[PDB]
Design a protein around this ligand. Sequence first.
Ligand SMILES: [Zn+2]
Lengths: 331, 195, 51
Amino acid sequence: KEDLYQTFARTVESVNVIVSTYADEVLGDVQVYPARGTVAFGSGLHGWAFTIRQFATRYAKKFGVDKAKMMDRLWGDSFFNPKTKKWTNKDTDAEGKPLERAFNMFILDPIFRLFTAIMNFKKDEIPVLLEKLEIVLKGEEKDLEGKALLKVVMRKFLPAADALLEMIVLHLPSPVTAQAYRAEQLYEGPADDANCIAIKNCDPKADLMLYVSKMVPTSDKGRFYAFGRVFAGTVKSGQKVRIQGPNYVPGKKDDLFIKAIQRVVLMMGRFVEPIDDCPAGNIIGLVGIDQFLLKTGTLTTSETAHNMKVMKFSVSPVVQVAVEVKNANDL
Amino acid sequence: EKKAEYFAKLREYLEEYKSVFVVGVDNVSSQQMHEVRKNLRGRAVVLMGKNTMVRRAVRGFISDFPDYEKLLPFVKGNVGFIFTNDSLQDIKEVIIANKVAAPARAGAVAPEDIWVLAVNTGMEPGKTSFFQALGVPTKIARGTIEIVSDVKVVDAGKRVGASEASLLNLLNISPFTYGLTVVQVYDNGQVFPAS
Amino acid sequence: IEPSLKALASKYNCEKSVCRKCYARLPPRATNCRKRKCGHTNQLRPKKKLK
Ligand SMILES: [Zn+2]
C-alpha cells in the first residue's frame, strides 16, 4: 500500500512539473492534485474508478468530520486507529512505532483486502467482505469467480462513471470560461472587437461563427463531415455562411466561398441528425463545407470577422513517399 | 638524492622554528590547504611527511641533542608538519578558523542520519521528478520546488547512493563538512596534547 | 530499479571482462582467461555496457 500510494505521488507530481513548466498562465488553478480530487484513479478495461472526494463521503459517515468540505487529509495524515479516533501529522507514534499515510489505510479496507481475498478463493470470506462493502450481487453473477467476478464486483462499488462524471463537472472550465482566457490566442484580431466579446460571453444572439480544423469520414464515402465547434452564435441548416480559408484576409478576396450550410448534425459516435439550430460552445459534425475547404475552415457571417489562428498542430510533415500507379490508365 | 635533500630541509626545523605544531590533514579535501600555504606564507611554513618518523629517529641521535625523542611516537594517521616560531595558540586559532568545509559524500558510508527538512528549495521545476525517484515527497507549491515533510534519506552506517548525493549537493546539504584538526604542539621538545 | 540495486546487479553482470577468443564472461581485473579452450589467453576486452 505504501509502495502504491508513492506510485500515484511519483506520477501526479511529475505531471504537476509538466503543468508548471508551461507556460503563459499563471492562472493559479492550472496544477492538479489528489487532495483536490482532480485527478481520478481507476481502470478502463475493468471499468472501475474513484476520486478522493468519493472516499471522503464514505469515511466521514464512518467516524469523521467535516463531510461537505475540508476533508483533504486523505493523502496526508496519518491515522493510527486502535488507540483513539485522533490522527497526527507525525510519521511515528510517541512509542517509536511506524504508521501509514491514511490513503494506505482507506485503500486497504476495500481494495487490497478484496483482491487478496479474491486470489485466496475463500468462498465464505468473500460473502463476508461483500457485506462490509455493502452490496450487490444479483442472479447468476453470484455464481461467478476469478478475474471476471472481481471486475463485475468492482464496477458496482466504484463505477468509473461516478468518478469521471464528478471529475468532469467539478474541476473543469465551461465554454464560457474556456473561451474567456483563450480567445486572445485563438482570435488573431484585436481583443476589443465585438466578436471577441461574444466569444467571451459565449453568445447565441451575436455574430456567427466557428472553425472545423479536422474532418471525420462518412459511412458512404466519397464525402466526409466537418467536425467543428461553434465559437459564437447559433447555426442553423440551409443558411448562408462565409467560408474563409486558411489564409483569407478580411480586406482581401482570396480563399472566400460564400455558401449555404447544407445540414447540421450533433455528433454522437455513429450518428445523428436531429436539429437545425445549434448554439456556440458546442461541438458539431457539419456537412456542406467539404468541397470548399481544406483542413482549416474559419466560417463567418460578417465581412469584418477575422480568420482564426492557423495552428501550430506542429509535429512536422515529415517523411516523403513517392506514389506511382500500375497500368497508368488508373492515374 | 631527493631523500637527502628532504633530510636536509627537515634539519632546519626544529632548529628555527622551535615550535613545530603537527596536524593531519588525512582527509581535507583541498585545494584550501594551498590557501593555508598562502595565508601562512607571510609568517609560517608547512612541510608534509612520509616515513619521516625514521628521519626524526636518525636526527634523534646527534649526541648533543636528545629532545627529538619526544617527536618519535606521535605521528598516527596521514599527518604533516606546520612549523612556526610565532607562538602556538595563535596558530591553533588560525588553522581551526580556516577549515575546508566543501561537498560532500557520494558512494561512501554516512556517519549520521541525513535528515532533510521541509520548506522551499529555491528552484524552478525540473528535478522534482529526480527527487521522488529516491524517496523524497515533493510538491510544487506555486512555481518553486518544495519538500513535503521531514524524512530520513539515508541512516548512519549505510552507504550513500550516487543519485542521493547529487540532490544533497544541490539543495539539501548533508552536511559532510570537515577539516584538519591539530594533533600535537612542541617547542623544545615538549609534549603537548593540543586542547 | 533504485540505482543501488542496478549497481548491484551490473556488478554481477556488466562490470565484467570477456575473453576475445572464447567469448567467455570473465572477471574484470583478470589478466588471463580461466577457460583452457582458448589457451588461457590474455586477449580480453570489457563486456559492453547497455546504451
Ligand atoms: Zn578465453
